[PDB]
């Protein structure tokens, strides 16, 4: 486990019908603990999650406690098949590149 950080995660696109390339790729995923004070090499917490963690530290059961989620994404050049024609197009938000607590 550990603090909130970026972890490798393979995603399979052979399930997707039209995708030719890639077939599997590294999409990654954010995972870890959102401690207070923070101990992670991610950018500093936003004020909102800071106030959430400080409410929780004073004994407040948050309905949705802070979560380790991606804060930045990168695209991928997907080669897919539309009708019977091959299309190489950029698809955004395919890879998680940065993590944070929110």
């Amino acid at each position: 486990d550990g603090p909130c950080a970026l972890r490798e995660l393979s995603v399979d696109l052979r399930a997707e019908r039209s995708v030719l390339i890639p077939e599997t790729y590294q999409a990654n995923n954010c995972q870890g603990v959102c401690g207070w004070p923070q101990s992670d090499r991610n950018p500093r917490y936003g004020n909102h999650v800071v106030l959430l963690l400080k409410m929780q530290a004073r004994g407040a059961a948050l309905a949705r406690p802070p979560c380790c989620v991606p804060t930045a994404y990168a695209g991928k050049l997907l080669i897919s098949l539309s009708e019977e024609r091959i299309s190489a197009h950029h698809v955004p938000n395919m890879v998680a590149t940065e993590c944070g607590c929110r």
Partner: protein, 109 residues
């Protein structure tokens, strides 16, 4: 001057192909004689796409991958079926990790 430090691939895109993968590398001067070669910017992996019909096989796309993903460690091109656009056509794709490895494959039984 010196040997290429980056991966070089066969580059080809049939007229029926929409879009391009040329942004994934830099086209080399091949002596202005076919086929083109491309030096990859973001990976050490070449890819190849073939359209397999009744009795023939047409190359559709050849070029660079945008990243090193599982399957790229292959030294040679071993295509596997990826699409069935029509009952008489099957699209096979291969990825490999050596120079010009996407040129062709051994055989598709």
């Amino acid at each position: 001057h010196m040997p290429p430090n980056r991966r070089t691939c066969v580059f080809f895109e049939a007229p029926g192909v929409r879009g391009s993968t040329k942004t994934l590398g830099e086209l080399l001067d091949t002596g202005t004689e076919l086929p083109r070669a491309i030096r990859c910017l973001y990976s050490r992996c070449c890819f190849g796409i073939w359209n397999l019909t009744q009795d023939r096989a047409q190359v559709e796309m050849q070029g660079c991958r945008d990243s090193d993903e599982p399957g790229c460690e292959s030294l040679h091109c071993d295509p596997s079926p990826r699409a069935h656009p029509s009952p008489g056509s099957t699209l096979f794709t291969c990825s490999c990790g050596t120079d010009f490895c996407n040129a062709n494959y051994s055989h598709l039984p």
